Design a protein around this ligand. Structure first.
Ligand SMILES: *[C@@H]1O[C@H](CO)[C@@H](O)[C@H](O)[C@H]1NC(C)=O
Ligand SMILES: *[C@@H]1O[C@H](CO)[C@@H](O)[C@H](O)[C@H]1NC(C)=O
Ligand SMILES: *[C@@H]1O[C@H](CO)[C@@H](O)[C@H](O)[C@H]1NC(C)=O
Ligand SMILES: *[C@@H]1O[C@H](CO)[C@@H](O)[C@H](O)[C@H]1NC(C)=O
Ligand SMILES: *[C@@H]1O[C@H](CO)[C@@H](O)[C@H](O)[C@H]1NC(C)=O
Ligand SMILES: *[C@@H]1O[C@H](CO)[C@@H](O)[C@H](O)[C@H]1NC(C)=O
Lengths: 243, 126, 214, 111, 48, 48, 49, 49, 37, 126, 111
């Protein structure tokens, strides 16, 4: 649904979708050959099906070709300042693929807008849909376009076939949000039986490790998934299938 | 003297196909776009679609599926306008229009400024 | 402590009483004048037209500095870029590379023994590539600056009252390391001794077993 | 979208100023800064005076100005004459199926 | 210590090698530097 | 310490945070390690 | 004058111009959209004023 | 403003301290002074000498 | 599909046959520029 | 047989415009450039400007502002040479010239080698 | 720049060698290595036998050589014949308004 969305929004008023309550098989995403840029900040593009996440964000764009480099941590530039800000400690992937077919009409497809004037750079994931006229001088504008009074939005266009870095790149961005809470979106692993009192290599809801899983006497609260020790290491775990 | 000329008028009955030209003058034919606007009787002006003199890439209004194919000629700087399966409301004054910027690489200015014009060419269908 | 191009202590200075002299890295100029015979300098490479040349002259009322492609005389006594108009007498100067100038003027009664510090007075951002210089006409002195280390002693007012030439002698090296002008009796590690290599040897094996290019 | 809304006919007097309204959708005028107006001398070709809402081609008399707020574009004619009697059409780019929309038109009759 | 995470398994279950060795290296230096400090603290305290 | 400059107030007035973080980190790991060196000296010297 | 200079020279004989004694408003240079590459090694382009 | 903890910026030199009239004998060419720590010990105003 | 070349000694510079060897590039190393010991 | 053929001679009086096209043969028309050199009477040979068969981009000598517009035809491999506001010294022998390298991407070799030629086309203006 | 300087006419004898001068500006010949010479047989087309100052295209007889110094380019014809009687023009790229400059030309008359 998110990847094959009918139409996306422009970068300035970008659409955010919430993804949860499932299993997910990202390996098909990596094995597509349809994605010109598949770069991730922290993950192996592989092995991504061995993880568990609480909330998976899907942000998605109409940015320009030469611009894709800016959808990344630590970048600075036109979109990365007033249109979309990734945080420094971003934990996700940035999937880009030029859709010139979908939106590039002769005489240019102009549906897609971007803020060009802004007083201050955005905070991470901050979205600004303000349509106030930009006061670029010392005199008030009062919604009157003219000198030092410019509407802060502009239309990209994306000429049909004139884009080498001037083409629509629907940059979908996954932001992987984990509270060390109930993970909810994690990949197709077969939940084998459980073995007790024996050293095993376990993977509970994305929490990995090696140890001896024994019956406890601790009293967990209904909202708690796992205890911890003084060392910040895992101490007790709730079986996600058996309470 | 940058000026656009189509052919004379046509008299059609429904179901036919019609050939409208538009030669250009006074500029570089491969730079600007060619826009096309008609005037239905009593209702205002109406754009079909366009064609790029550089490559010939086409597009048009959804409401005009399959009933329009825009062709062109770079050698004579002439662009051609086609409308098949003609109906009564197709009676209109058909204009050829030039874009107010040259096709430019890595561009920003949008290419729908309708600024240079044909004399006009009325279609009669009944 | 700092490193720049200074006059190494107790060095030879050429005593004159006209010709053109080199500018190797920076020239220290001193003069003892009674009747103000010395009037200026010339700086450059050829000191003849078809290249820019620094010209500094005091004509009786002011100081004029100009850098044209001048027509110099053989025995002096266009496309211009920069212009500016401003034995008892001991005048000292330091000329180094843009172009920077210092001076210090004192009275005296053949080079007086004693210490005084030179202060910057004019900046000339001309960027002329200088190698030769000649003094325009009494005795005057010329020595050459070198990249040496010094330990400068600022007094209460920011006045430089002493200095240590750092490579003048092993005693002066010790004053460098201890950051002091006084050294208590003892043994001090000052530097490191190191034999430098004499030649480069590049080797690869016997040249037998050649490929059959023939 | 649909055809824009223009007054059917506005009258006045020479030298007096008359303004013409042009209402559309937020996807026709309110999302964009691309309003352009036109005029019809009877039996003649269009002529562009307005584009970039308040900007102008070279050669258009300083009597015609364009303005923008909300869903309303507007054209003002200062110092009217019988020279000015014509039909008037506002145009805009749209963020939807089509690309260009026009108003119904306005006949300015000089009395 | 500037790592994206303080659990090395997360580094393993997150990263491919071509960026993992950089990230675990950032963890390797601080943690070793921590034990290094601790031993010296003990060594001095042991002499006490 | 390999940072472009040795003044924190410069670096902050010189770089935006995503790049300044790298340079400041160079001072911190160095300057701390010098402070760490000084403390170890004092402990040993204080024992004397 | 530097940026909108008449004619630049070639790279091997690259031209140098000295700029001093004024106030500088680099923000107009950053806010131009006419520069494909604006990379700064030491300044952020912002805060340069 | 004198005799008060303020943040200050003289010619780009940024810091926090108390600006007081000093009695140091600066020479007419010296722009500012330093402490032993290679830190700014004094400045002279770009507007008022 | 293939045609032969009419190489003759009386032809011009461009029509003369030319022997061309292309050395496309571990077991094949360069020689040994050595000095005295 | 790579050979350039222009039109025959012309006899003009001052102020007219003249049409001198040059067809090509024996090669790929879209690769090389077309250079144009005249010979004023008594003074030597003189280049106008050129046009690219790939795109039609033009340029010419400053001393020849507005008098000259170079056009071409890819379909017939014919390139056309225009000179208006004709004057007496415009009496000259015009030759179409081909560049000694094909238009190549990211190239180094400069494209003014004048190596392939037309028979001629003397202009007479009085 | 301006048209290059070539001798008006040089004569000689068959088998003897004749050299042709070509003077320009430092922006015409002295800044570049791009001198090329051509010949006019009367009523015929040019022919390129000299380029890259001293370089030669395939098929040019080894009798014609080109040389370069200062503002002077030069063409030497060794072993002259009545076969060689023609007009000669030197050409060069220029670092100025234009791109190509030619000499006035030289008629070599074989006696
Ligand atoms: C888990 O789901 C399966 C169906 O896939 C069902 O058989 C089983 O009862 C469920 N168990 C729990 C604890 O929800
Ligand atoms: C200085 O010159 C004297 C002779 O004039 C010479 O004996 C001495 O070695 C020189 N010293 C230096 C450092 O050049
Ligand atoms: C002075 O500069 C001009 C600048 O083009 C130059 O032509 C001239 O040769 C220069 N003068 C000398 C003596 O070199
Ligand atoms: C000193 O000489 C310079 C020569 O460049 C001249 O311009 C200047 O006027 C002279 N000064 C006086 C006071 O005459
Ligand atoms: C200075 O002039 C000399 C002339 O001998 C030249 O060799 C040298 O390269 C010049 N310096 C520079 C920096 O060009
Ligand atoms: C500093 O200067 C004052 C006069 O300005 C003078 O009286 C005093 O002696 C100087 N102090 C030193 C240490 O030179």
């Amino acid at each position: 649904e998110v990847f094959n969305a009918t139409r996306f929004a422009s970068v300035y008023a970008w659409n955010r979708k919430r993804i949860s309550n499932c299993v997910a098989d990202y390996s098909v995403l990596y094995n597509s050959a349809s994605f010109s840029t598949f770069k991730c900040y922290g993950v192996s593009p592989t092995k991504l099906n061995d993880l568990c996440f609480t909330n998976v964000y899907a942000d998605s764009f109409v940015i320009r070709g030469d611009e894709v480099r800016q959808i990344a941590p630590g970048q600075t530039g036109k979109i990365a300042d007033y249109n979309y800000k990734l945080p420094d400690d971003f934990t996700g992937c940035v999937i880009a693929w030029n859709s010139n077919n979908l939106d590039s009409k002769v005489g240019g497809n102009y549906n897609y807008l971007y803020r060009l004037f802004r007083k201050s750079n955005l905070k991470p994931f901050e979205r600004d849909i303000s349509t106030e006229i930009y006061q670029a001088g010392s005199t008030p504008c009062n919604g009157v376009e003219g000198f030092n009074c410019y509407f802060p939005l502009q239309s990209y266009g994306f000429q049909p076939t004139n884009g080498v870095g001037y083409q629509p790149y629907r940059v979908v961005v996954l932001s992987f949000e984990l509270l060390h809470a109930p993970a909810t979106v994690c990949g197709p692993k077969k939940s084998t039986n459980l073995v007790k009192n024996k050293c095993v290599n376990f993977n509970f809801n994305g929490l990995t490790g090696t140890g001896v899983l024994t019956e406890s006497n601790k009293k967990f609260l209904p909202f708690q998934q796992f205890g911890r020790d003084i060392a910040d290491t895992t101490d007790a775990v709730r079986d996600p299938q058996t309470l | 003297q940058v000026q656009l000329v189509q052919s004379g008028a046509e008299v059609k009955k429904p179901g036919a196909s019609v050939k409208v030209s538009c030669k250009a003058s006074g500029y570089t034919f491969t730079s600007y776009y060619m826009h096309w606007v008609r005037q239905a009787p009593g209702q205002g002006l109406e754009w079909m679609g366009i064609i790029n003199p550089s490559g010939g890439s086409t597009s048009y209004a959804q409401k005009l599926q399959g009933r329009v194919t825009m062709t062109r000629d770079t050698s004579t700087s002439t662009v051609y306008m086609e409308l098949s399966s003609l109906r009564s409301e197709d009676t209109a004054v058909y204009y050829c229009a030039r874009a107010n910027h040259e096709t430019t690489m890595d561009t920003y200015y949008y290419y729908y400024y309708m600024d240079v014009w044909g004399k006009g060419t009325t279609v009669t269908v009944s | 402590s700092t490193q720049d191009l200074f006059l190494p202590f107790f060095s030879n200075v050429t005593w004159f009483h006209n010709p053109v002299l080199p500018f190797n890295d920076g020239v220290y100029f001193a003069s003892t004048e009674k009747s103000n015979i010395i009037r200026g300098w010339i700086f450059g490479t050829t000191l003849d037209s078809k290249t820019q040349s620094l010209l500094i002259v005091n004509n009786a009322t002011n100081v004029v500095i100009k850098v044209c492609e001048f027509q110099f005389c053989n025995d002096p006594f266009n496309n211009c870029t920069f212009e500016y108009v401003s034995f008892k007498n001991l005048r000292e100067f330091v000329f180094k590379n843009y172009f920077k100038i210092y001076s210090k003027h004192t009275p005296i009664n053949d080079l007086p023994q004693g210490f005084s510090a030179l202060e910057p007075l004019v900046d000339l951002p001309i960027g002329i590539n200088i190698t030769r210089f000649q003094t325009l006409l009494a005795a005057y002195y010329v020595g050459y600056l070198q990249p040496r280390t010094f330990l400068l002693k600022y007094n209460e007012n920011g006045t430089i009252t002493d200095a240590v030439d750092c490579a003048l002698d092993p005693l002066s090296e010790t004053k460098c390391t201890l950051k002091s002008f006084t050294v208590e009796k003892g043994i001090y590690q000052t530097s490191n001794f190191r034999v430098q290599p004499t030649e480069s040897i590049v080797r690869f094996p016997n040249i037998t077993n050649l490929c059959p290019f023939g | 979208q649909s055809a824009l809304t223009q007054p059917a006919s506005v009258s006045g007097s020479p030298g007096q100023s008359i303004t013409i309204s042009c209402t559309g959708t937020s996807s026709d005028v309110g999302g964009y800064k691309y309003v352009s107006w036109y005029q019809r001398h009877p039996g003649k070709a269009p002529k562009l005076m307005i584009y970039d809402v308040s900007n102008r081609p070279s050669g258009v008399s300083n009597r015609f100005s364009g303005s923008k707020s909300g869903n309303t574009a507007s054209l003002t004619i200062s110092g009217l004459q019988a020279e000015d009697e014509a039909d008037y059409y506002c145009s805009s780019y749209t963020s939807s199926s089509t690309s260009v929309v026009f108003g119904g038109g306005t006949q300015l009759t000089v009395l | 210590f500037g790592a994206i995470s303080s659990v090395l398994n997360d580094i393993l279950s997150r990263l491919d090698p071509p960026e993992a060795e950089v990230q675990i290296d950032r963890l390797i230096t601080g943690r070793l530097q921590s034990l290094q400090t601790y031993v010296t603290q003990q060594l001095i305290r042991a002499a006490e």
